[PDB]
Design a binder for this molecule. Structure first.
Ligand code: NI
Length: 341
């Protein structure tokens, strides 16, 4: 049965709640982004209205075959009316097509559901600045002070410089990047751009990427692996066995692999600067785990919430254990006392 933290009070609405069957009293289903923990349950047989971004709606139609008549895409940064309630979709700084949802309840309560997000000061100048928010349904993935990670810009600088150095030293090296969902496209796109190559991938992944409105994408990606020196592979194949096997397939075109696994956080973060990251190496194969996050660090999360000053916070992540829940509630109280709201 649907958990309370997926239900919007005073409306007929749910958020990311497609795996519970027909939810009692739900007249419209919102989907914040196309990640499987969130869309789980959607298919061509769904016949309720789904509200989402344009990009999410392209993925619903093309990848899951949801029928067009039930997809209701909304423009960003635009007041819209849904079953008599005003809503606004905002950029969540997560994967492509990911949104936060502002609901303006008929009784005057204003609710922000962040979906999955990476808080940024740029959000302090969206339509959020213009009214008070009473309740915040918060992506608390990394709600603990041990979770520090560098900016996305620093991580991409490291990756570009590392790849460009390796291939310049050895023109016969192949670069491989791991993927298992949408998100983190900058990793593989930036490396292909510095090397003057397209990124080669499976037809299924190319299809996925063509749904994302990324400008000049026909310019950066391809299904012709033979013409490409940056390859995308399933995240599960980014290990020494899976990579030795791939190198065999390239028919002696290459004699070395440099591979990247964009992880979220890994405890090498608490001790080591991005400058200082080193690969695991075996033979002619090296693997770098790089901390490219699409969720808030602790400090980014803290700043957003202390700026927004909500009256009540509802966590959406790490809610299944009493120790997690207790930890998060103690941080929310600190933040409120330190800021004075
Ligand atoms: Ni997500």
């Amino acid at each position: 049965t649907c958990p309370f933290y997926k239900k919007i009070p005073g409306t007929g609405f749910t958020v990311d709640a497609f795996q519970y069957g027909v939810v009692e009293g739900c007249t419209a289903y919102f989907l914040t982004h196309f990640h499987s923990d969130h869309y789980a349950g959607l298919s061509k047989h769904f016949t309720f209205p789904v509200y989402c971004s344009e990009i999410t709606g392209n993925l619903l139609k093309n990848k899951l075959h949801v029928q067009e008549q039930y997809i209701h895409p909304l423009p960003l940064d635009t007041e819209c009316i849904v079953n008599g309630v005003k809503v606004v979709l905002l950029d969540a700084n997560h994967c492509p097509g990911a949104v936060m949802i502002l609901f303006y309840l008929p009784n005057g309560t204003v609710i922000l559901h962040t979906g999955d997000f990476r808080a940024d000061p740029s959000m302090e100048r969206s339509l959020l600045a213009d009214q008070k928010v009473h309740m915040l349904y918060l992506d608390t993935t990394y709600c603990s002070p041990e979770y520090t990670f560098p900016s996305q810009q620093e991580v991409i600088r490291f990756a570009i410089n590392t790849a460009f150095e390796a291939v310049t030293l050895n023109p016969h090296a192949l670069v491989v990047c791991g993927t298992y969902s949408i998100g983190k496209e900058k990793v593989f796109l930036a490396i292909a751009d510095v090397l003057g190559s397209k990124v080669g991938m499976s037809q299924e992944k190319y299809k996925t990427l063509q749904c994302l409105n990324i400008p000049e994408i026909n310019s950066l990606i391809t299904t012709d692996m033979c013409s490409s020196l940056v390859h995308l592979l399933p995240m599960m194949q980014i290990n020494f066995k899976g990579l030795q096997s791939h190198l065999k397939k390239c028919g002696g075109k290459y004699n070395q692999i440099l591979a990247f696994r964009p992880t979220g956080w890994t405890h090498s973060n608490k001790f080591t600067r991005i400058a200082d990251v080193i690969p695991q190496t075996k033979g002619n194969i090296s693997i770098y785990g790089i901390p490219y996050s699409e969720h808030s660090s602790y400090l980014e999360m803290k700043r957003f919430v202390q700026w927004l000053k909500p009256q009540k916070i509802i966590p959406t992540v790490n809610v299944g254990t009493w120790k997690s829940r207790s930890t998060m509630e103690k941080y929310f109280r600190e933040w409120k006392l330190e800021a004075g709201y």
